[PDB]
């Protein structure tokens, strides 16, 4: 069976980028004669597994009508060194006489892994035979080779040079409208019921790839078999072949299929965005229009911001009283410009084994180039000072393993790549001066004490994940603390909600759960630490250098 | 006033023992091996 | 093996200078050897430099009481090896200097070894220490084996104010590590092979707080005080760096030498090191 | 279908060497000496990848019609052990059928790496086979082999010998006219428009190479094809501006070797110290006879001290223009940020590279670590405590005095520094950088206001009269603090003097007053206590 354009979905914007890149050297070679530059020959697809990259290669080959040939990954390594090089030479010879042709290879990570970690004999055998055959061929036969893997920097870095493999293409996860199109192709033969809604299952699975959606409906259809298992047993060899027409996979079987399955490709963070607005936290309006003057002005007017010779405002910081909404603002800083964003933290991503501690920051630099735009943000800058190191005396420095890869490439990228580093610390007196320099953190965004008289509006958008009592008591819940922000306000909520497991085998939420919760009204963020930095908010211009 | 200790690990070998291409055996058959002393091998003629 | 290449390295530049009709350029010049020495790849530069320098005794002025004492300790065993075997007593191995940092007590020791073509190894006191724990005693005896294999060599221990000051004064945690690093060289002074012409030469400031087990005979017994040189022996210092002067001075240089005794043996050497700021500056504008 | 001399550019000074280093044996063995012929074949070219090492080797081969035989390191290393021994003999047997020929050998660092990690028979077999045939071709067969790698320190030093490998050719990044020259080469058939630029994007490419130029012209032309279909073709400058924001910087972990052209009039004032530096170093680089006619030595290290960060980097940039040489920018806190081994081997791996790139100059900063990191005996730090003081006394005097490598140094507080190594002769030109004058910083501010338009009703001397603690770099935030309001009023509703009051006092202050009286404590005694202080 052959596939076409309708058999794939979700990556319709991504497929159109691969469409014009491969159909121009195949169909119309007259643009090469007019502009006088060589069109590319080797593309490379990558991303999470189970996104149908092998299905997209068969779709672009049959619709264009070119001579398609497939070279799978592990079938080359199942042979020895002798016959594998002869089979690779035979594939390129038949595609030359059948021009135009597409020589699609698959699973280049098994053939070309990272060579420097295992300096071996076979790790430079089949790839050196391929490299003298890929760069060595020249007959103007306008053939295209397509590669596929699961990680762009897992392959040997010599393959990503000019003339061999230049255009990198990322295959991302589909959206809500994209994952709806995947199940519609698989359910063409599945006799579903009338109560099954099409758009309801798209919002159910948030981070499921197309391989996970196709395994979800088959498990739900298998539950329809075990639901009708007591109706007709398996001892009769398809004797009662008249009740099988009443086999409809109704929608709660998909609810049971979601209850047993698990997300497979969600072992990392989100790749697209986060959506929590500035109105989800209460107040802080004195910095809302202030941050609109520094991060969304240059991306909307790239000419008037740079023709005056001013540097791009790449880095801001959040400082003030410790633990007072800046940890709550860790996710609510990406929805203003609505760009791509991945949060980094000390014990989260840079505290892994050796060799992978710098590859995570390499992905945000591929997001600066191949998946632009990007937003970088690092929180809790005083905990990272233990890993960076403190400079002592007059001759010091931050001898850290990760700051060499950070500070060099964060300044080499221009304003067109849309790099944006965001800082958020808890105390400015616990900041290493070796990382701070004029040109990186010249934008001062002071975070004050988070509005203890108006903190009732903070907890109003915090108790919206649970059905609560309509007769709420919000008189003096957070105005008597003055050191308990929205992060530590959960402990007051945990006081008024841990009693649900008690007094059981009825009332669930009463007014006494919030009225008697003021007996632990303490203050962890005292006023002695706030007033040191309230005067620093108007005098940091005279201390914007070393400290 | 401290130390750094790390061990190692090895993998020895695997083998296949593949040999004897067919073109060497076809040349291996058409030869001689020697004949003691007086073990002539003869000629013959006929069919006038 | 390098000398076989330097004749060819300057011959090709003679062909490159032009491009008997073309063979008259084959006669090499004395500056093309300097061009071959200008882009020279020295064989001693490919590894550590342990060659003998071409310094002599005429480059300095004064310090002649040290010179007559340093002509018997390390030269008489190697020039007349049968004299000390007649009496069966080997000569003393070790000479100690002490004084101000202005005189040439660490700089004239190179002329002692290079006279009889001996190797020179200069180690500094606060250069190698015990960073981790015990990482200094293995780095002391690691040079004693090659000091006698490539003999004649000497070893020049310098600035002993980081080791020879702590005997019973420092009682801290660093003082406990100080007691572990000073007995390595104290046992190696009498445990070394004294028949392989290996010598120690010391020159250390602050001669009052020296360790008492190093001023004993056999290790450092030549108590030679090295002050600044005499005020009449300061004109003979300037014979090395400059020789060509069209006015021939030498009475004004001794006038400022005899003015005060506080002038150092290196500060009066710098009155001709400032010639590029005094005389060569206003004489090259032509 | 071949290439020539016009198809490559940028590389000119050592290309003029290599156009005569191999042509002199190949064109005529008779006219070399005609008595004893000594051809030093075995040229070793090295440099970063993408510099066109193979293309510049085929330029001299196709010019003289030489047969360009090509092999590579890993393509013959990954074969069988007995097969690589025969195939190397099958490669060198072409020296008699195509003489005068050229044998190109690449990736010898994979063939002959450093001999510390391995002790083996098969690991030394592939390098002893080429030793046994290097003297086999000593019958003057008129062939010259070419060895191409990344760096000479990766090759085993027994290969580099007088008779086998002595010729060394360094291939680095091109200058501002060099990448301009390869931009003309790769656009010989590019049908562009009249609005394209040739000089702005050329000087902007710092860590780029001609192979990266080849990806720049193809990616910019591909963007032009995308918005045409959706003869009717035309390539504007904005396609190359899209390639500027989509470029791929590869050469980033290397110090800059390129020379600059910034004049001394870019900075204002301090004219008394530019003539003192011009009377010391730019005279012996043209003729060193002034130091030998009276028996003197050139300077080893200079110093700068005063207010920190007041524009000493651009002063270190401008010293490579009056001397007509290159410039090496080594960072300040790299003496402490580099670990054990990295603080010793990396600071001398650029020094012998500076000897190959002579004449040049090296810049160092934060020289106040000699008086605080001398007694290194703690069991926590590695090369940041004791592995700096043990080598700066040796590596500063470990020069050759024949290629004139120079060190530029700069510190902040010289009162705590010991005068033991600070005597003249080695550390001789210790300089106090003062506070800049009123005409000095406005000459810098005239260059800072060059990049932006400004009305002529603005004056800069009204803020210069009250500069008690404001240097030239302290007033660099005036174009950031005052000019932040000129962007908001122009882009919200679909350069003047109104924002001069918001940057009048609260712009930037870095120079304090406690160390300001300390900056003249040594400067008043620079004429009497010049030796020690
Ligand atoms: N348009 C589409 N987009 C994404 N997934 C799809 C689409 N159409 C079908 N699918 C489902 O996704 C799967 C495609 O995955 P595929 O077979 O390409 O695995 P892969 O890991 O990408 O291949 P490879 O092993 O070459 O990496 C199919 O099993 C199919 O059910
Ligand atoms: N000095 C130069 N540096 C880089 N590229 C150049 C230079 N001069 C010309 N080019 C052109 O740019 C391209 C750069 O690719 P090229 O393969 O020459 O780089 P390379 O590093 O020599 O390759 P390899 O690493 O395979 O030897 C060449 O195709 C060449 O035509
Ligand atoms: N006789 C001398 N008179 C003046 N200066 C000298 C003399 N001998 C050596 N020097 C200078 O002293 C240096 C060598 O000794 P020095 O460094 O002073 O040792 P120390 O500092 O340990 O006393 C040389 O650089 C040289 O210029």
Curated annotation (Swiss-Prot), chain B:
It is found in: Cytoplasm; Nucleus. Residues 1-48 form the Ubiquitin-like domain. It comes from the Eukaryota. Exists either covalently attached to another protein, or free (unanchored). When covalently bound, it is conjugated to target proteins via an isopeptide bond either as a monomer (monoubiquitin), a polymer linked via different Lys residues of the ubiquitin (polyubiquitin chains) or a linear polymer linked via the initiator Met of the ubiquitin (linear polyubiquitin chains). This is Ubiquitin. The gene is RPL40A. The chain holds residues 2 to 49 of 128 of the full protein.
From Swiss-Prot, chain C:
Present with 78400 molecules/cell in log phase SD medium. ATP 2 binds at residues 102-107. It is found in: Microsome; Endoplasmic reticulum; Cytoplasm. Coiled coil: none annotated. It comes from Saccharomyces cerevisiae (strain ATCC 204508 / S288c) (Baker's yeast). This is Cell division control protein 48. Component of the heterotrimeric CDC48-NPL4-UFD1 ATPase complex. The CDC48-NPL4-UFD1 ATPase complex interacts with the HRD1 ubiquitin ligase complex composed of the E3 ligase HRD1, its cofactors HRD3, USA1 and DER1, substrate recruiting factor YOS9 and CDC48-binding protein UBX2. Interaction between the complexes is mediated by interaction between CDC48-NPL4-UFD1 complex member CDC48 and HRD1 complex member UBX2. Forms a complex composed of CDC48, NPL4, UFD1, UFD2 and SHP1. The modification Phosphoserine is found at residues 43, 90. ATP-dependent chaperone which probably uses the energy provided by ATP hydrolysis to generate mechanical force to unfold substrate proteins, disassemble protein complexes, and disaggregate protein aggregates. By recruiting and promoting the degradation of ubiquitinated proteins, plays a role in the ubiquitin fusion degradation (UFD) pathway. Has a role in the endoplasmic reticulum-associated degradation (ERAD) pathway which mediates the cytoplasmic elimination of misfolded proteins exported from the ER. Belongs to the AAA ATPase family.
UniProtKB/Swiss-Prot annotation, chain D:
The keyword NAD does not apply. The first ATP-binding region has low ATPase activity. The second ATP-binding region is responsible for ATPase activity. ATP binding to the first ATP-binding region induces intrinsic activity of the second ATP-binding region. While ATP binding to the first ATP-binding region appears to prevent ATP hydrolysis by the second ATP-binding region, ADP-binding to first region promotes the coordinate and cooperative ATPase cycle of the second ATP-binding region. Its main location: other. GO terms for molecular function: ATP binding; ATP hydrolysis activity; identical protein binding; polyubiquitin modification-dependent protein binding; protein phosphatase regulator activity; ubiquitin binding. Changing residue 53 to T: Probable loss of ATP binding. Complete loss of catalytic activity. Changing residue 107 to Q: Severe loss of catalytic activity and cooperativity between the 2 ATP-binding regions. Lethal. Restores cell growth. It is found in: Microsome; Endoplasmic reticulum; Cytoplasm. The keyword Cytoplasm applies. It comes from the Eukaryota. Disulfide bonds: none annotated. Present with 78400 molecules/cell in log phase SD medium. Component of the heterotrimeric CDC48-NPL4-UFD1 ATPase complex. The CDC48-NPL4-UFD1 ATPase complex interacts with the HRD1 ubiquitin ligase complex composed of the E3 ligase HRD1, its cofactors HRD3, USA1 and DER1, substrate recruiting factor YOS9 and CDC48-binding protein UBX2. Interaction between the complexes is mediated by interaction between CDC48-NPL4-UFD1 complex member CDC48 and HRD1 complex member UBX2. Forms a complex composed of CDC48, NPL4, UFD1, UFD2 and SHP1. This is Cell division control protein 48. It comes from Saccharomyces cerevisiae (strain ATCC 204508 / S288c). The gene is CDC48. The chain holds residues 209 to 791 of 835 of the full protein.
């Amino acid at each position: 069976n052959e596939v076409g354009y309708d058999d794939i979905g979700g990556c319709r914007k991504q497929m159109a980028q691969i469409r014009e890149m491969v159909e121009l050297p195949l169909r119309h070679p007259q643009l090469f004669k007019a502009i006088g530059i060589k069109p590319p020959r080797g593309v490379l697809m990558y991303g999470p597994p189970g996104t149908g990259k092998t299905l997209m290669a068969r779709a672009v080959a049959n619709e264009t009508g070119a001579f398609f040939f497939l070279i799978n990954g592990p079938e080359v390594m199942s042979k020895m060194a002798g016959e594998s090089e002869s089979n690779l030479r035979k594939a390129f010879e038949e595609a030359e006489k059948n021009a135009p042709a597409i020589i699609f290879i698959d699973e280049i990570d098994s053939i070309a892994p990272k060579r420097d970690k295992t300096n071996g004999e076979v790790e430079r055998r089949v790839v050196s035979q391929l490299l003298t055959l890929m760069d060595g061929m020249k007959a103007r036969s306008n053939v295209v080779v397509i590669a596929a893997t699961n990680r762009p920097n897992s392959i040997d870095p010599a393959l990503r040079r000019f003339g061999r493999f230049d255009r990198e293409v990322d295959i991302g996860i589909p959206d809500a409208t994209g994952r709806l199109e995947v199940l519609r192709i698989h359910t063409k033969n599945m006799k579903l019921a009338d109560d099954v809604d099409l758009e309801a299952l798209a919002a159910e699975t948030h981070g499921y790839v197309g391989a996970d959606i196709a395994s979800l409906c088959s498990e739900a259809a298998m539950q329809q078999i075990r639901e009708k298992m007591d109706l007709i047993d398996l001892d009769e060899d398809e004797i009662d072949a008249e009740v099988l027409d009443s086999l409809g996979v109704t929608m709660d079987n998909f609810r049971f299929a979601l209850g047993n399955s698990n997300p497979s490709a969600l072992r990392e963070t989100v790749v697209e965005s986060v959506n929590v607005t500035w109105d989800d936290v209460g107040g802080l309006d004195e910095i809302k229009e202030e941050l609109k003057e520094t991060v969304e002005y240059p991306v909307l007017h790239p000419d008037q911001y740079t023709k005056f010779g001013l540097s791009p405002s790449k880095g801001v910081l959040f400082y003030g009283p410790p633990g007072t909404g800046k940890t709550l603002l860790a996710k609510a800083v990406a929805t203003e410009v609505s760009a791509n964003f991945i949060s980094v933290k000390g014990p989260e991503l840079l505290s892994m084994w050796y060799g992978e501690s710098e590859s995570n920051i390499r992905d945000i630099f591929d997001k600066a180039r191949a998946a632009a735009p990007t937003v970088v943000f690092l929180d809790q800058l005083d905990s990272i000072a233990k890993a960076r190191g403190g400079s002592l005396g007059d001759a010091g420095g931050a001898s850290d393993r990760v700051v060499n890869q950070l500070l060099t490439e964060m300044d080499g990228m221009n304003a067109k790549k849309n790099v944006f580093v965001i800082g958020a610390t808890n105390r400015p007196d616990q900041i290493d001066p070796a990382i701070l320099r004029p040109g990186r953190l010249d934008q001062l965004i002071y975070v004050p004490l988070p509005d203890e008289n108006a903190r009732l509006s903070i907890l109003n958008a915090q108790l919206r994940k649970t059905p609560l009592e309509p007769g709420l008591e919000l008189t003096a819940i957070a105005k008597a603390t003055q050191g308990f922000s929205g992060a530590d306000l959960l402990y007051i909520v945990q006081r008024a909600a841990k009693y649900a497991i008690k007094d059981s085998i009825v009332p669930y939420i009463t007014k006494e759960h919030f009225a008697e919760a003021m007996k632990t009204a303490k203050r962890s963020v005292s006023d002695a630490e706030l007033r040191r930095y309230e005067a620093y908010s108007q005098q940091m211009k005279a201390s914007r250098g070393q400290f | 006033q401290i130390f750094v200790k790390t061990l190692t690990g090895k993998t020895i070998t695997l083998e296949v023992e593949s040999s004897d291409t067919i073109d060497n055996v076809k040349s291996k058959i058409q030869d001689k091996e020697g004949i003691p002393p007086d073990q002539q091998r003869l000629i013959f003629a006929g069919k006038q | 093996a390098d000398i076989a290449s330097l004749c060819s390295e300057a011959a090709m530049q003679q062909i490159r200078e032009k491009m008997a009709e073309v063979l008259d350029s084959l006669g090499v010049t004395m500056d093309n050897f300097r061009f071959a020495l200008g882009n020279s790849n020295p064989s001693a530069l490919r590894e550590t430099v342990v060659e003998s320098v071409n310094v002599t005794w005429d480059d300095v002025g004064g310090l002649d009481e040290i010179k007559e004492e340093l002509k018997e300790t390390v030269e008489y065993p190697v020039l007349h090896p049968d004299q000390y075997t007649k009496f069966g007593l080997s000569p003393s191995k070790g000479v100690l200097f002490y004084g101000p940092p202005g005189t040439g007590k660490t700089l004239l020791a190179k002329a002692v070894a290079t006279e009889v073509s001996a190797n020179f190894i200069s180690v500094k006191g606060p250069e190698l220490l015990s960073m981790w724990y015990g990482e200094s005693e293995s780095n002391i005896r690691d040079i004693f084996d090659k000091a006698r294999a490539a003999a004649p060599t000497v070893v020049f221990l310098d600035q002993l104010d980081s080791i020879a000051k702590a005997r019973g004064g420092s009682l801290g945690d660093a003082g406990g590590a100080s007691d572990r690093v000073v007995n390595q060289l104290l046992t190696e002074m009498d445990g070394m092979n004294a028949k392989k012409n290996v010598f120690v030469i010391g020159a250390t400031n602050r001669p009052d707080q020296i360790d008492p087990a190093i001023l004993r005979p056999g290790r450092l017994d030549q108590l030679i005080y090295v002050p600044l040189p005499d005020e009449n022996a300061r004109l003979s210092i300037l014979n090395a760096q400059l020789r060509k002067t069209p006015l021939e001075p030498g009475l004004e240089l001794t006038a400022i030498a005899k003015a005060t005794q506080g002038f150092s043996g290196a500060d009066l050497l710098y009155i001709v090191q400032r010639a590029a700021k005094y005389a060569i500056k206003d004489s090259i504008e032509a």
